[PDB]
Amino acid sequence: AVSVDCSEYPKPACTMEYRPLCGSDNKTYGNKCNFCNAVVESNGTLTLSHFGKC
């Protein structure tokens, strides 16, 4: 329902951004780079739970 604009994805590489994203799958991410990509790889099987670390 909310995953920020992931149109620039997939990316050719992720940055060291330390943005913790708690995917709706009860998982933690390193940043929106791993969230939009994990979203372009799952084909949409990944959602968001709360921009932060769970």
Side-chain angles (χ1 to χ4, degrees):
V2 49
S3 28
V4 172
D5 168 271
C6 304
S7 273
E8 148 68 321
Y9 290 75
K11 284 200 215 216
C14 279
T15 12
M16 251 114 90
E17 201 98 71
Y18 216 145
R19 260 279 165 216
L21 300 189
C22 182
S24 238
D25 70 339
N26 225 7
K27 225 247 156 170
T28 288
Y29 270 121
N31 57 2
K32 74 184 271 212
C33 186
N34 229 261
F35 192 61
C36 286
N37 241 110
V39 163
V40 170
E41 76 175 17
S42 260
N43 224 11
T45 1
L46 184 65
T47 24
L48 177 105
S49 131
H50 96 274
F51 261 75
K53 170 187 197 152
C54 264

